[PDB]
Amino acid sequence: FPTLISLLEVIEPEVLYSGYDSTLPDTSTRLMSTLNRLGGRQVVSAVKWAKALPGFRNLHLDDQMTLLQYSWMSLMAFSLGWRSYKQSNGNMLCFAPDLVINEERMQLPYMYDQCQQMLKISSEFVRLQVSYDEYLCMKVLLLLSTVPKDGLKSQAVFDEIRMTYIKELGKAIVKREGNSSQNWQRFYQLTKLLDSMHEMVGGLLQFCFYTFVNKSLSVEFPEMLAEIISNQLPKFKAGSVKPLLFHQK
């Protein structure tokens, strides 16, 4: 009776408010620090979501930690893309109900380029007219799409979970359309989007890494996010991580 997709709908966390203070000088540093504060709280939600995600807690605890540390920015950027798609059709960055960034508020130092990168992710949801259930299944697969080159401790459990949610994405596609005639074409398009997320998020991550390590910029990070980045960053820069791609890339 209960389907995996119906459970994904039910565990999806509610959207957080930023509590942003509009009376303060609109500056790039203040904005980046406000966004990181929101990001730390969204990462906490995401960890609670992963604990509730069927199958995830069967992984060794060190693998649960690895997957969340490696994929957090993909998860956050994908969900920002979805919110921006549903709330503005990809025209504004809809970070929170009380923090919406339109094109002219983007005209800020360093900010404009990173903001355009985030809009491109939203623009793919518009292009493909992604359904909610396709989005939820894809989001699981982002949690499961970056791993150490040397492998995981519970590799057999991981391979089982990942294959389970690849199957579930297929079920979401069938549920969407009704003419199964495009089901393979749709699966191809969405797995190409998954593969492309590694490149689309890579530039966000490099910028985050720079603002993290370069204390001169005075960008603030909250404690749990700082801990995660401090563990993720050396593995990423050393080339010890690999993306799990569906297609020849």
Binding site: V44, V47, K51, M224
Partner: peptide, 12 residues
């Protein structure tokens, strides 16, 4: 223990 580990270990 990191904050992430504590959260993963917390009942919920």
């Amino acid at each position: 223990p990191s904050l992430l580990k504590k959260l993963l270990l917390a009942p919920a």
